[PDB]
Structure 1
C-alpha cells in the first residue's frame, strides 16, 4: 500500500498513522499485490506448490483447435489443452493410400506437433481392421496401415506436446 512517513514532532500524526493503517488493512482484503481467498485476480511469477493443490471449480489451460484433411480423405481434428493434444480421426478414404506413405495434403501445424513420433492407433468401421497414423515432430503424418483405397477410419485419444 501507499503509505506516508510517521516521525517525531510530525504534523497531523494521528491522521497519518490512521491513513497508513487503513491503506495497509485494505490490501489484506482485496487488491494491491497480494493474492486473496476471494476475488478474480491475475497472478504473475513462477508459483511452485509443494503441497496438495485441489481444484473444485475448473482448471483451464491454454486451448487451441485445428482440423484438416491430412490426405487421402482422412481428416484429423485436434484440440490442444496445455501439454496434451486430444485427437479424433475421421473422414473416409477417397483414393489409394499406399502402405507406409506420407499423408501429403496438410501437415499438423508446429504448435500441435509432438516432441517424438506419436503412433495413433485407429480402427476401420465394419470389420476387425486396425491401422495407425504416425505424427512426427515435423507434422507430416504417415499411414502405417497397408495399402487402402476405401473405408472409414476412426480413433480418439491423446498425444503429448511440450513447452
Structure 2
C-alpha cells in the first residue's frame, strides 16, 4: 500500500538513510541547472550544477584589455552557482605554456589572476564545489 517493493516504478517520500552499501545499475538522475555567460573581456564560463558540485568549462576568446588580477564585470555568476569560499579555476591558453586561474567568489564577481592580457584562447574543464569550507586563514 505504502511500502516499497522489489518490482515496479514507485515514488518514495521521506528521509531515507542507507547505513549499508547502495548500488545503482541503471542511471542515477538528480536535478541539474546550467548557466553560461561572458564574465568579461571575451571570456566565457559555462556551468552545470548537480547537487553541491558544479561542472565548469572555460571558453571564449580574449577580445579586450584585462588587467592583471582584475575583476571580470561584464556578467556575474548567478548566486545559485556561487561557492561559499573562493574557487580558483586553473585554465591554459592555447598555443603556449601560459597558465591562468579565475576565481569565482561568493559574490559571483569573477576575478582573473593571469597577467595583463588582450588576446588569446583560454580553456579549461573541471569542477568546483559549492559548499567546501576552507577552514582557517
TM-score category of the 2 structures, normalised to the smaller one: over 0.9
Other structure's SS at 1:123 match? strand
Could you tell me which residue of structure 2 aligns to residue 75 of structure 1? 44
| More deviation, 40-49/133-142 | 40-49
Task: Compute the TM-score of the two structures, normalised by the length of structure 2.
Answer: 0.93
| SS of residue in 2 equivalent to 1:67 | strand
- Aligned-partner Cα distance in 1 for 2:111–2:11: 42
Shift of 1:153: 0.2
Shift of residue 115, structure 1, vs aligned partner: 1.4
Please, what is the CA RMSD of the aligned residues? 2.2
Per-residue CA deviation, residues 11-66 of structure 1 (Å, 9 max, x unaligned), is xxxxxxxxxxxxxxxxxxxxx21111112211111111000011111111110111
The answer as to 2:120 corresponding to 1:161 is no
Cα distance per residue 1:43-96 (max 9 Å; x no partner): 111111000011111111110111000000000001101111000000000111
Q: Which of the pair is proportionally richer in helix?
A: 1
List runs of 5+ in structure 1 lacking aligned partners.
1-31
Q: Distance in 1 between matches of 2:32 and 2:113?
A: 29
Instruction: Return the structure number with greater relative CO, CA threshold 8 A, min gap 6.
Output: 2
Distance 2:85 2:3 in 1: 41
| Bigger strand share | 2
Q: Distance in 2 between matches of 1:142 and 1:44?
A: 42
List alignment gaps of at least 5 residues for structure 2: 132-136
Q: How high is the TM-score relative to the length of structure 1?
A: 0.79
SS of the residue 1:89 aligns to: strand
CA distance in 2, matches of 1:91, 1:134: 17
Q: Report how many residues are paired.
A: 132
